């Protein structure tokens, strides 16, 4: 199976546009910080998040990522792998190529992918397509630097669903 292109790809996708690909040495590689399997075609879903958010990739979790970006069902039957990538995704001055969704009208259903860039409405006046008072652009960019702490450093996450 083409796992090399899944795990060793040069560029990873943002969590709001998380990538999906259709499909013992991985377990014994010992290069992964998180390897958790629930319940035991294959789907490999790849994205990049913060370290403190890795706890949100699990069935029955709440937060920004779990509710607005990536949701896992209660009866999940796959595995989650996550490893640190500070030496690749961080650069001096800041790497701002990764985005995530902050506001949404409703929670995401399991395995839902929202890429809309419509301006979120918080008040009553319509946004009319321009940012302003009580109207926010939904997607915000991460900031990764080589000096940040472990929880603020980038992490690459791959979810395998059978």
């Amino acid at each position: 199976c083409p796992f090399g292109e899944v795990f060793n790809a040069t560029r990873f996708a943002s969590v709001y546009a998380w990538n999906r690909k259709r499909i013992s040495v991985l377990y014994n590689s010992a290069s992964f910080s998180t390897f958790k399997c629930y319940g035991v075609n294959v789907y490999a879903d790849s994205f990049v998040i913060r370290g403190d958010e890795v706890r949100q990739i699990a069935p029955g979790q709440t937060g920004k990522i779990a509710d607005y970006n990536y949701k896992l069902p209660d009866d999940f039957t796959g595995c989650v792998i996550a490893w640190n990538s500070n030496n690749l995704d961080s650069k001096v001055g800041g790497n701002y190529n990764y985005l995530y969704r902050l506001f949404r009208k409703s929670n995401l259903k399991p395995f839902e992918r929202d890429i809309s860039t419509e301006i979120y409405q918080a008040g009553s006046t319509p946004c009319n397509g321009v940012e302003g008072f009580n109207c926010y652009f939904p997607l915000q960019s991460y900031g990764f630097q080589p000096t940040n702490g472990v929880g603020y450093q980038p992490y690459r996450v791959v979810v395998l669903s059978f």
Partner: antibody
Amino acid sequence: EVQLQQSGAELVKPGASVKLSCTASGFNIKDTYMNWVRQRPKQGLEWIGRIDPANGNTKYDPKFQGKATITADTSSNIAYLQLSGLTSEDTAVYYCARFDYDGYYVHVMDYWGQGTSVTV
Amino acid sequence: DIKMTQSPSSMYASLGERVTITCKASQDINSYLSWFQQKPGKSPKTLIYRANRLVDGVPSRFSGSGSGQDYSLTINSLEYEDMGIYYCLQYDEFPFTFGSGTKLEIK
């Protein structure tokens, strides 16, 4: 709302060329695929090809190889289809569509265009 | 190229009658099939994807089933707004292939 706007009708003499445009609003085309479909008068639907604007890779139906070329500009959020060597059998309405189940996702909706009439 | 077959080409049905359309492929496609409906003069719209999943907003009277090489679409209570041409598409292996189409009319 998500909209896909296509160019107007074009009259093409035989053997000439024409470039069609599909402008996308409401989303960034870099995050999805864009498909091209053709429907001849009183005929069925045929798939031409697709492009991934993130890297520019394209796929084609091999009977349309050498006749159509797909290009996308991420800065302007416009997808292009170039037709060359047109004959009288290429008179049809051309569609640009955005399916999301071709990326094998769940709880998705399709978005189509209005269609451009090309007469030869 | 995965040749795609549809049947019947045209049929008539009264209001409230149930209608089934057959969609058969030349080889296994792992249930990657989609259904389209096109009203006169309008652009096509996707009704069912993955052969049993409904697009949000579609009436619940629509249903789809099938596996392997045989797939089908069923309408329970046919109404006026169900006339048109119906297509089924495969997207498992390139190139994508449509069907010949089925025209539905009301007596």
